[PDB]
Amino acid sequence: LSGAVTALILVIASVIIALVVVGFAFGLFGAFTGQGTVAQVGTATLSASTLTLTVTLKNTGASTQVTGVLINGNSGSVSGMTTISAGVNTYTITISIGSISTTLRGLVGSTISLTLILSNGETVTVSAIVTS
Amino acid sequence: TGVLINGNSGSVSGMTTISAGVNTYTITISIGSISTTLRGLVGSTISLTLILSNGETVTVSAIVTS
Amino acid sequence: LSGAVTALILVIASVIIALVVVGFAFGLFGAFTGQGTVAQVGTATLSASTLTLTVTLKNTGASTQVTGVLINGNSGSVSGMTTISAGVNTYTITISIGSISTTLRGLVGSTISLTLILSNGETVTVSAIVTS
Amino acid sequence: LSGAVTALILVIASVIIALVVVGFAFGLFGAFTGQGTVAQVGTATLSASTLTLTVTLKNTGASTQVTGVLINGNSGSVSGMTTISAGVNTYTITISIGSISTTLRGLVGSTISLTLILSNGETVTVSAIVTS
Amino acid sequence: LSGAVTALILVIASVIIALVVVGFAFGLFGAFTGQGTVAQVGTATLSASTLTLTVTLKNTGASTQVTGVLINGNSGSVSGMTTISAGVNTYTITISIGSISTTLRGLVGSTISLTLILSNGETVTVSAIVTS
Amino acid sequence: LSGAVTALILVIASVIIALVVVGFAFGLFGAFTGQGTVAQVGTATLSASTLTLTVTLKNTGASTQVTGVLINGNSGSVSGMTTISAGVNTYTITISIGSISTTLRGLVGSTISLTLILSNGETVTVSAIVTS
């Protein structure tokens, strides 16, 4: 008689566990779909006298952060408008590096490529015109 | 039961009932902040999620128009 | 007995999930195909006395917008016919920059290159004759 | 009952592995963006009496090295200012070849083309005026 | 009573097997990452009188071997510095083909392209100047 | 006792199914490799008086067919040597269009570009000299 009791107990436990796994899979779907996709929608302007990056970013996911910046050699901090809203927006970020100060002064008018290290593990490649 | 756009989850207010077969549904979404946020994405692609009553989430791709 | 129940539950869940993924992939196809492709089909005219750009644009995709303009140094707003219908059309856009006013007055008759920053993340390179 | 346990074990392992791969891909992005781009921004001067190359180089990436030089026939070593900082800078490199000594003495005033072999796998083509 | 005994036996077997599979997957990751990446970081020199290839190779993976060479028509053996250490290094490889002897003697000064067949399944394309 | 029976039944069924899938994948490999690659290996001659295309085609795959032709405006049928053997061969195809008759008569000596729509879904771009 114990055999059928064990059979039912195991059947119901397996059903509960399978439903848990399926719910987890669909939660993973919904979470990865809306994780946050940040890209560039136009050229940036890198003021070399003040070292200020004005960039237009498009974010069609969750509201992420800007944790770091990667310029030619050094990775520097950021000190302005770190919060990336959703949609398309123009952000004005003040970059802080030790050595790059006055290094760009000899590049006014030329193009440059930066990287933005976001909080959600994504890195964004940015193109900019160096100005003064 | 619900919709999931870039940041926020919002209610739906139309044709919530999914009949069987293939059908074209016109769902009115309601979020507080996303109002006028998509106005700068006209023409671009976007990805949404639909939270159904049977525990299944459906991933949808959409073109943003105006 | 529970093993086969679990097996069928997982099989059906996997079928549902795979169908969801395939539908999403084909939706992505159809969405990226008709996202909006804007190009130039003839030289533009940049009136320097009024700073007005008359340009013929071809758009074989979705109806986009014109968010910004990029002239030699500055990025400026636009204040006319920002909506790009489908097909080939002649648009008359009034550009607004602070300093470029009366700067092109010494370029009448010469060629120039502008950029149009569209709402769908695309930038269009435009060539124009500067007139007055 | 074991089926669903195995299913969740594999699901979580797959999520971990996929996240690892995605992080690696974005790291590759960030690394290749700032790998180091060196070009020339003005004519060089090749002193043929002392065989010294004075060249103005622009480097908008990581700080690379100058490992070799390639003049008409021979590849020779360099013995000065091997380190290329970031930005635009004027470098005075002392080249050393066995045979080219006194060979350029018959080219004073004419043009010549060199190659620079950098540490980051990139070769830079340089143009120079031979002087004395 | 046997049902639950079988259930636990199968559960522990499944956990052991899944852990084996996951460990094997991560080992595959670590192994394919450091398998050996060999490329060229500067033009090679192909001495046509002695038929000797002086080439600068960059290898950022495991220490591979040079098993064969592929010149214009024929694949030939190699007889020197077959072992590719890690890093950037200058290798002097003596090639041996029966027919190509004295064939390059009419190509001095021109450019040529060779292939190196490595031990780790990778073929490396090399560009060289033919000298004498 | 039923649990282990179920486990082995599912194990053998899964092994059979996995082997079926792997066999199908390798069949897909072998089938896509030898599908038929048709290209041009020399200029074609388009006789405008008789409207006859003499073209040398190279096909290193399966023996495909020529289902249609695409000339400047119209898509026309073919009425000769529709079968493409393997190897390099010179084919003489009689094209049939309603309007193009006597239209090429004003292009004798000039170059033109055609398209061949093959049976295997591949289109081949051809260049031809218009003759008479």
Author numbering:
A (entry chain K), C (entry chain E), D (entry chain C), E (entry chain I), F (entry chain G): 1 to 132
B (entry chain S): 67 to 132
Mind quoting what the paper says about this structure?
We present in this paper the structure of two additional archaeal T4P, one from Pyrobaculum arsenaticum, a neutrophilic hyperthermophile (optimal growth at 90 °C, pH 7) and the other from Saccharolobus solfataricus, an acidophilic hyperthermophile (optimal growth at 75–80 °C, pH 2-3). Although the full spectrum of functions played by archaeal T4P is yet to be uncovered, they are known to mediate adhesion to various biotic and abiotic surfaces, and play an important role in DNA exchange, intercellular communication and biofilm formation. Finally, we show that Pyrobaculum and the Saccharolobus T4P are at the forefront of virus-host interaction and are recognized by two different viruses, likely serving as primary receptors during virus infection. We show that whereas the N-terminal domain is conserved in all bacterial and archaeal T4P-like filaments, the C-terminal domain of bacterial T4P is unrelated to the immunoglobulin (Ig)-like domain shared by archaeal T4P and archaeal flagella.
This was a rise of ~5.3 Å and a rotation of ~101.7° for the P. arsenaticum filaments and a rise of ~5.0 Å and a rotation of ~104.6° for the S. solfataricus filaments. In the S. solfataricus pilin, similar to S. islandicus, only about 1.5% of the residues are charged. In S. solfataricus, we see clear extra density consistent with glycosylation on seven residues, all serines or threonines. There was no apparent glycosylation of this virus, and the small extra density not explained by the atomic model involves a few disordered C-terminal residues of the capsid protein that were not part of the atomic model.
